[PDB]
């Protein structure tokens, strides 16, 4: 019983045969969920069955959120996305409000359901198809196709906008003090209210979403032992502002001074006022790499100087909404992880680091994924776009564990690469 709203035309970029990605293996645990959840979707009519005739395909996987609702269905549509047309409906319909980042807290709502109340272009469903597999391949593949707007497809938000706006219209009008952002399947609500006051306000908006357009949002799950829910809230008022890359000591060896100059030479790309020849002269001889301790008094006056130069925020911050965002993450230390976000190389727009995780959960891939997910969270609240990740791992490894740790509704683009001592120099800025 989908809305009587008309079918908005949807077509893709020229010369793009749409998605045709194959499905990766899934755990029995995931299958069951990905099943019961999709079958009901058949009855509800938001999905129908289709056979081999549809040569297109996109992947799906279940992720177990820690909320009162149930499993979450995720249809990786990154491809279909890029393949899909340019939707002005978002170009204007989804303008990022600056003050969003400036708030005492912000909450994340999964409002995916809202997209079932609207139908999808009759002539486009062939591009949403996914295939649920089975253990040991008992049977062949069961392939479902979308009828309504698919959760997590760049087009979906774009279209639904008008509806989402009128719905929130009352709430925002009531307490205009609140700034609401829409991103794919999430609703970002920030306020400078008190944690308790904020929660309640959220719940209100969560209530409203019920009475109107049967917008049902996942219901969180609270408990006692280790209180995770207390941190579900997203406070960006004290968001890690990078500025912890320094070096200092007394009696320095050749090795030391040598390494130091090596650093600065590269740093000269991020900071102009840099004098490298100074120390280079201090060590202009085939001296012993080790014991050698060329204690200089002249270098000091300039060594502290480079610091004065790169003293605070660098003059270069310039976000151009025409360019993509890039994120770089490197394994700097045990448990600790560092990251940077740039549009142009060596001119980073922001920096940061995913530190030690307060919990016995020890897993490299996990630490990384959690990092990327939290990095993305930031990139969203600010610029509003998701940065391309240059992952510090091999395609193979990531591809066999990233799912068993992901938890967000949206998914970022990512590629695999390796880093040199330049970045791993503990001087992250790339």
């Amino acid at each position, epitope marked *: 019983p989908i809305s009587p709203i008309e079918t908005v035309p949807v077509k893709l970029k020229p010369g793009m045969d749409g998605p045709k990605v194959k499905q990766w293996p899934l755990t029995e645990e995931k299958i069951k969920a990905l099943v019961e959840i999709c079958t009901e979707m058949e009855k509800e009519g938001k999905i129908s069955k289709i056979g081999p005739e549809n040569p297109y395909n996109t992947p799906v996987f279940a992720i177990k959120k820690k909320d009162s609702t149930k499993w979450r269905k995720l249809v990786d549509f990154r491809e279909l996305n890029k393949r899909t047309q340019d939707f002005w409906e978002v170009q204007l319909g989804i303008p990022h409000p600056a003050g969003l980042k400036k708030k005492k807290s912000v909450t994340v709502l999964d409002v995916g359901d809202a997209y079932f109340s609207v139908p999808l272009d009759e002539d486009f469903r062939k591009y949403t198809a996914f295939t649920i597999p089975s253990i040991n391949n008992e049977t062949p593949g069961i392939r479902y196709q979308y009828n309504v707007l698919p959760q997590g497809w760049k087009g979906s938000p774009a279209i639904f906008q008008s509806s989402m706006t009128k719905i929130l219209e009352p709430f925002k009008k009531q307490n205009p003090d609140i700034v609401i952002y829409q991103y794919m399947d999430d609703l970002y609500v920030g306020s400078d209210l008190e*944690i*308790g006051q904020h*929660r*309640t306000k959220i719940e209100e908006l969560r209530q409203h979403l019920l009475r109107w357009g049967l917008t049902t949002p996942d219901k969180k799950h*609270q408990k*006692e*032992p*280790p*209180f*995770l829910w*207390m*941190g579900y809230e997203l406070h960006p008022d004290k968001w890690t502002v990078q500025p912890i890359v320094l070096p200092e000591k007394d009696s320095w060896t050749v090795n030391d001074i040598q390494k130091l100059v090596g650093k600065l030479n590269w740093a000269s790309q991020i900071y102009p006022g840099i004098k490298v020849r100074q120390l280079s002269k201090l060590l202009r001889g085939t001296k012993a790499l080790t014991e050698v301790i060329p204690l200089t008094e002249e270098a000091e006056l300039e060594l502290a100087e480079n610091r004065e130069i790169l003293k605070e925020p660098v003059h270069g911050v310039y976000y151009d909404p025409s360019k993509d965002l890039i994120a770089e993450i490197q394994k700097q230390g045990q448990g600790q992880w560092t990251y940077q976000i740039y549009q142009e190389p060596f001119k980073n727009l922001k920096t940061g680091k995913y530190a030690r995780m307060r919990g016995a959960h020890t897993n490299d891939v996990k630490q990384l994924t959690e990092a990327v997910q939290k990095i993305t969270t930031e990139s969203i609240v600010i610029w509003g776009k998701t940065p391309k990740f240059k992952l510090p791992i091999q395609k193979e490894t990531w591809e066999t564990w990233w799912t068993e740790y992901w938890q967000a509704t949206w998914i970022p683009e990512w590629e695999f690469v390796n880093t040199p001592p330049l970045v791993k120099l503990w001087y992250q800025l790339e």
Partner: antibody
Amino acid sequence: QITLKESGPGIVQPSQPFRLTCTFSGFSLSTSGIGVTWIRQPSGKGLEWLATIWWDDDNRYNPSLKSRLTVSKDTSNNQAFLNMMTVETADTAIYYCAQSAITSVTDSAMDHWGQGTSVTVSS
Amino acid sequence: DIQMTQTTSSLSASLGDRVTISCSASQDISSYLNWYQQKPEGTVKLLIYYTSSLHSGVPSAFSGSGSGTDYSLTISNLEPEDFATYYCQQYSKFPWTFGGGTKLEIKR
């Protein structure tokens, strides 16, 4: 600051039941971190945990009493309650209520109590 | 449902003295232990949380200590008011349990 006083029947014939009340002033059983906890202190014994009432309606009892124990809370008038059925000798003790609050991600203790009531069980 | 045991039942000390109370658990509570002080007059007040963090309004002398399944509570220099019963509490497994407090009486 916030405070909570309790009140009971004072005396209850064994096998009969009773109802204790905790009238609090300061917080609310409608705030993510708040809560109300009933602790019983038997004659000469130490402190025993009976049950704890939580904002989200999630109530929890002691596995040993839930059978003859039930809690409540008229949120509108800042009052939580403790109901005990079929009371036997032992139960004669001083019951206290306490405002419990999940202060933060790692902290959750009983912050404020109040001299409890004395319920006596005798024929 | 963790068996909480406060070994030392009732100790004796004097003004100026230093006292340490021993609370033992039945399984790593990850510091989920509190400290309640019940004065002879009946009233029970909150001293500290996280087996370490000092509760707003409680004097420095009250320091938190402990790890694993063995924790401790120590008062720097005992003053006439600190002579009461100290109840140890845990909060990992929901059946909140108090391990018979430790009496801190006047040594005469």
